Design a protein around this ligand. Structure first.
Ligand code: E64
Length: 212
């Protein structure tokens, strides 16, 4: 795999979103990976609905948090609508998938990256955007403005994001806190430290969609 990957440069990443106060990061994270794999497999970049996963993933807890793997399983089992059809409201409401016509996109499964393994994660990122988790509660992460982030931070993961690239010393992350946070919405997180958890626990739990 190459020394640099940046899925934005291949036109496979949509604009940075803001989840607001709702604990919907798990849905935003999943949608980044759907938008990516559909561009990779079909040539077309579209925005898909975080709100639909928020409302409809019965294994998750709405704005009280959720699971990227369950959200991804939902898209593989049923499908997902365009963001325009099912726009983001920042609050969990009833599942309205049935009321909104046929699904826009569908995937074929979900796989997990072997946890606590930097190289396995890089291998997956070289193939597509990956849903990853990290510890975001620390004030160093909250106040991040730019550069390759080394912490301080622990490994108590609490925030789902999307890895959309990497370089020799970092993994490139699309956050869902708006374009004014970090590097226009992104953070580069230090890698290669020898810590099996990853910086801020970045290697704890990583999933990606499969599409034939
Ligand atoms: C993340 C966010 O929006 O910043 C959000 O709090 C979240 O989804 N957290 C997850 C953990 C990450 C995926 C690591 C979470 O806490 N999931 C478990 C669901 C919440 C616990 N149970 C109940 N009933 N609320």
């Amino acid at each position: 795999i190459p020394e640099y990957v940046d899925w934005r440069q291949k036109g496979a990443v949509t604009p940075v979103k803001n989840q607001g106060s709702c604990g919907s990061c798990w849905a935003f994270s999943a949608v980044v990976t759907i938008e990516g794999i559909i561009k990779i497999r079909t040539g077309n970049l579209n925005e898909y609905s975080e709100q639909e996963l928020l409302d409809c993933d019965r294994r998750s807890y709405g704005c009280n948090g959720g699971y990227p793997w369950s959200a991804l399983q939902l898209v593989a089992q049923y499908g997902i609508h365009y963001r325009n059809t099912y726009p983001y409201e920042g609050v969990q409401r009833y599942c309205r998938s049935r009321e909104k016509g046929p699904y826009a996109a569908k995937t074929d499964g979900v796989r997990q990256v072997q946890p606590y393994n930097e190289g396995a994660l890089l291998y997956s990122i070289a193939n597509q955007p990956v849903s990853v988790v990290l510890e975001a509660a620390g004030k160093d992460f909250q106040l991040y403005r730019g550069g390759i982030f080394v912490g301080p931070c622990g490994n108590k993961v609490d925030h789902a994001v999307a890895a959309v690239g990497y370089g020799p010393n970092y993994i490139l992350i699309k956050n869902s806190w708006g374009t004014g946070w970090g590097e226009n919405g992104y953070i580069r997180i230090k890698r290669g430290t020898g810590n099996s958890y990853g910086v801020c626990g970045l290697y704890t739990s990583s999933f990606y969609p499969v599409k034939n």
